Ligand binder design. Sequence first.
Ligand code: NA
Ligand code: NA
Lengths: 232, 232, 232, 232, 231, 225, 226
Amino acid sequence: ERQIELSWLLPDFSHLSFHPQTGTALSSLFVAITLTVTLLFIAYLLYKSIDVVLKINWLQKALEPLERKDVAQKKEVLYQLAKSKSKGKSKGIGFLWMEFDETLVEVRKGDQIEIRNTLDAGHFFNTYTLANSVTENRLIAAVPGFLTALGVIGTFMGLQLGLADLKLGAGVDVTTMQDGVAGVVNGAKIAFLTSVWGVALSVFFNFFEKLCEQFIRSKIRELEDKVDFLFP
Amino acid sequence: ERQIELSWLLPDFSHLSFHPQTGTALSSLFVAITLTVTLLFIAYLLYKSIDVVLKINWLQKALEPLERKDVAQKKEVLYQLAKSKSKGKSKGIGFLWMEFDETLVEVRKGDQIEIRNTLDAGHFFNTYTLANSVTENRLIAAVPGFLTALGVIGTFMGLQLGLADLKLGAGVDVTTMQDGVAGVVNGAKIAFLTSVWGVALSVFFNFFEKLCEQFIRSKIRELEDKVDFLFP
Amino acid sequence: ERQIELSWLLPDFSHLSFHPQTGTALSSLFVAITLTVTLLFIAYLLYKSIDVVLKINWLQKALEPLERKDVAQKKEVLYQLAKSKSKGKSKGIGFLWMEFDETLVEVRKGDQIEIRNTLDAGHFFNTYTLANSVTENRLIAAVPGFLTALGVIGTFMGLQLGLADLKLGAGVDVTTMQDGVAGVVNGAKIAFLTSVWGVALSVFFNFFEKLCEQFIRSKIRELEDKVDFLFP
Amino acid sequence: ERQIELSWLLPDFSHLSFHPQTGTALSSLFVAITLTVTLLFIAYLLYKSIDVVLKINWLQKALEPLERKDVAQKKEVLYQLAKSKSKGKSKGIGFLWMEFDETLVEVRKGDQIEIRNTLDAGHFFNTYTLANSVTENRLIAAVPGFLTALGVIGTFMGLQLGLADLKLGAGVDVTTMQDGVAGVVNGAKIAFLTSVWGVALSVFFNFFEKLCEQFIRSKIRELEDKVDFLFP
Amino acid sequence: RQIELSWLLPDFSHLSFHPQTGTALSSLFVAITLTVTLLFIAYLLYKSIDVVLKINWLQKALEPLERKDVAQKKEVLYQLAKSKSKGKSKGIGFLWMEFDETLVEVRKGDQIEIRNTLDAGHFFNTYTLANSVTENRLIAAVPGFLTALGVIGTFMGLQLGLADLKLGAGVDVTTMQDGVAGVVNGAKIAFLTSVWGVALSVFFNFFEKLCEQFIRSKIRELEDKVDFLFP
Amino acid sequence: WMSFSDLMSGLLVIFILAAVALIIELTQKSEQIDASIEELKKAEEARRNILIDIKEELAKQNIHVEIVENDTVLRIPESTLSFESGKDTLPENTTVKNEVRLIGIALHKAITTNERWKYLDTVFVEGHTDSNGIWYRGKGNWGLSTDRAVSIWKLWQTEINVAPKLSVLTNYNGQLLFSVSGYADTRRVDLQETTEEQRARNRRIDIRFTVKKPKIEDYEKAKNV
Amino acid sequence: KVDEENPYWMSFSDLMSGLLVIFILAAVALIIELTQKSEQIDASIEELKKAEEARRNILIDIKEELAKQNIHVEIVENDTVLRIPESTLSFESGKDTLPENTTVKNEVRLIGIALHKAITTNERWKYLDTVFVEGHTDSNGIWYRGKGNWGLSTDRAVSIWKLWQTEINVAPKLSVLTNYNGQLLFSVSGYADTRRVDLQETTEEQRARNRRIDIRFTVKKPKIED
Ligand code: NA
Ligand code: NA
């Protein structure tokens, strides 16, 4: 069984520049670009999903120490502390409570004074009002296509510049063209490295952003559990 | 005709490591990763699929020994069976019967008790309500793409391992060129072994996922048929 | 110049076995599986498609004697006729005529009873209410992908098996090399033959499936215009 | 800079038949089928797009001289014009225009007579009612896939048929083996030609169909631009 | 082996529709692929400025607005909504017409501040401002078309490379060496068309979704203006 | 898959370039080995060219010799070169002496042309007689046939003016080229040997050419490694 | 839902993999051509190596068979030539006759019997091309009735050849034996002083090394054409 070497999977990033003089330098630049694009969109997605998570956690911590019945006295004492945070926002979790706290009707069953919703809360607390820029964002959904495509561009550029070096013909010396083809084959391994990284980072980002989405909707439904158990 | 051995398609999982030194070690690493990803996502898909099925199946057992004539006095006998299972759970099967009960109206005949609905059962028992976690799950829908691209990475890596083994140029002996061709064959075997597992596992998950969707939809229509039959 | 016979593409199913030992036995079994998958999904498609066609055909059969001025004298008998086939049938064609009936508001056009509808008949007779099992069926829409990927699996399986028996390296003699080539060609025969059938069966089902949908949608439109003609 | 011969890409159709005896005839037949399938779907798309445009322009010509102050005294002429174009059909635009009129109610502005509408021009002049099988046609949208499949079947059939009867193995002379292997390699360009045509026509049709959709939609918007202008 | 990225730029001087050389053919593909990109960029820009112009008007015609103009602007906005919509029963005015005609008249105190009964969110959001660029099936297909154009160049390049490749008995080294030159010539077509086909596919795909988020940036900025102005 | 297929097409092209480049080198290595196999048959080629040279060169001079025994032996028939009956001396008819000089000149010119002696091991001048038993100083036909080969070989030394002498020519190994043989009537061409025209076919002078044979290293080098 | 994914793009990666394997066989076919050439040459080396081992086994057994009989012969020229020195087989000075003591001629018989037995044992003449019975003299110019050393050296080889023809009874006579073809195996020739083993010619025993009978064995050409 032949031994294989895989240390070439990792490019050398020490001599990175935007004017690569060799195919190895060009391959390293594209892997670095694809890594940077992946990190920029991960940070964009990760920071702006924690923003969604923090809004959810803030109100959950405002409803955790409540039993089934201790909601009439909390119906309004929760309202004042909402305004202390709601100021300044456009459609934040504070105003999202504002539009919902007002539409609870007050039912009077004698000594059964309670609170009840008049319709389903699916359009009040959901992924639209809280996750407005992650779940339906098609720029984020286009990132793995970007990452694959940058790897593809890097590979075909590496292959094309490998071929343009070739002085070739039927009238060219055979030993010359044997050396030329050998260099093309050697450079093809380095050229295809960007596609390996491009596809790998495309898959990793694809998995990561759909994992964050399923995590976001886990709490949004988890949030609706508290809403439909304390606010019938 | 020559005999073939299909055990050549089986990877060797005994010597798995993340530092493969041979082609068969690398191909078995890729197949193990693709299998592990497949198994994990099957478990995750089945975890939420069985959740929906068990959630539906409880009603089927609760509506099995019921006919057209006995619904009059089963209104509240089924109420405590739904109440006992709806402890805190927000929008599961238990609360749907709670939401379903209030929309039941008595017929003006006066004598004999017959029950109807003010709206069709589709608004009460459907995919959006019972199985919205698996039908629209966009992470699940991306799993075949994950497995496909894992096999593609193994394909590119294997083929460019074969590219590295090539010994070209003038003044190269036959034995050395023969060894280079053997390396190309060795790399191609890695590429095709990872591809056949990547594609096969991708298709299996793709079919299994869409088979689970149709099975759940067949169970939801069973509720739609049985509930509306008993409650026109 | 070389003569070809298209009958070479037909596998021999006489010696089908689930433990194939030769190249043709494996390619024949692989094509047999692909045919079986194609036939099972055509049966699944035709099972649901005929269910849609019968629902539309009957209600068409209940409207051709009806002209604009004969709707009033025949409006009520259809409701009884709709009850005739609708024993249960929570969402059958008989039930679809039910909900349409109560929405036909009655107006007086001087002296002749005329029936109008406040909505459009397409709200009750469309793909969702008639052919939801075939139009948006994700399993059926994925069948062309399954069959193509089967053919792709046969390629990597065939190529891997052929290359696994190709023994190169120092000391391998002409007889061993010559037998290795024969195994590689046998593997290539498996690869291309399964791709021929994988893609041909895929595109056949692809075309057949969408021909069935266009045929069904044509009958749904023939249902919408006739009901609009009878009930303005 | 060596010369290329693009005329080789176009195969000879002088002796087309459905019983190919050579790989060249098989390649020519599949290119002819792919071209024929492309033309039939382009002809159908052009036929079903011209009629929409021709019958929209009949109402454009009728509505062209109209003005806001002209509509009140000109309405009845169009209804006469609609019944001149529509002799009793329930499909043509003339029938759409007459069904539009009943939705027009008269408003009172001082003493002048000016007519309004209850529904919108999109209710009667939209893609569904005007270009039904031009826009939401899954069969038309699958034609680029058909073209891709047909081209690659031709290539797989060409490659499989070139390998199908090759006498190889230890009992076969080396010279015979090299003739068989060389024939397969030399015939690859013949089989591959159908994939070039399949992909090229697939891409062309995909672009062509989506242009016709935009052109038809642009005429729908222009039609309901003038109708809503004259009938607010 | 030193590379120059300038080798990736084709020669567009002697373009023609009958390429006799591999360079001319690859130049033709890049020219077509570039041409398709520019027209689809213009077709994207043309249908995007209209969306911006609708949003711009509600921002560039409400510069003399302050908080204290809750009601006396309500009537004057009505005829200026009809100023551009000269008989059009659609467009940005039609969104304002429904929003203006469904405003209840409230009474608190001496001052006449007006209150809504439903939020402007569902009336002035995406599915009615930008539906010609957000759900446009042709624009969505442009990156796939640009990539598929490069794939055509690859297949034609590969087919042209195999065209002059002859192997087997009776083939000398010079004929085979000419076959190498032909394969390289076809490979240059294949690689160059994919470089440009995929790069322009990226540039359009990223540009197309930069315009979209810029469209939402104006839609939100319009909506945020209305929210505090019109509670 | 659209980009995956485009990438795989790029790999195919690179492997096609490598395969054809490999075939180009392997092809050239084949003619190298093929040329080396032809070099191993060059000694037998040189022998055949010597005999055709002698026969052709003498045929232009009305001198009949025959290439016999698988193109290895230059037969000089009695019709061309006749000794006196029972004697090892050619007759004094002032023509056979001229006749035999031209055979030596032809023999010299054919060996030295293209330096074909580099492929020769030994050249044997063979004397052959008929079955007619004679006494010949007690030596019989065994001494007669030997003495005739020596008689021919002596004349080729001291009566032809060839600048590289026949007696000086070496062989592939550097040793002197020529040897003298006599076989009496034990190597007869005609076995029945009844008529005088059949006995005469046994009275001949045979020039046998033996070539060098390739060594082990010659075959090992022919592998071209 | 209108647009479905095009599932046949994956078939082109399928196609490219199969086309890759086809071009691998194009290069592998040449490998087999080159491998077959190497085996054909290897077959000739082993066939020639077998013939050369048959050569030296012939020479070892001739020397060993004669050694047991107090007859000393030499194996010289790298296991190729059987040398019969003057100390073993001595000719009368200036003559090709042998002494009439009935003991010298018996040794010449025994050399021929040993020579015949080694060639005919194990069918070893099938590996031989020609066996040369070689007459050699020293550089001393002699008259020999005008024939000189060419006559003397050839006559001495003939006299040995004639003794083996009549006075040893081996069932296939040495003059009837054939080589790997049907050609006669044995050649008898004289070389005069043209192929001396001693060049300086100084002393008597140095000159005596040249007066010898050589039996040179050549093996068949392995016939590279397989
Ligand atoms: Na296949
Ligand atoms: Na390309």
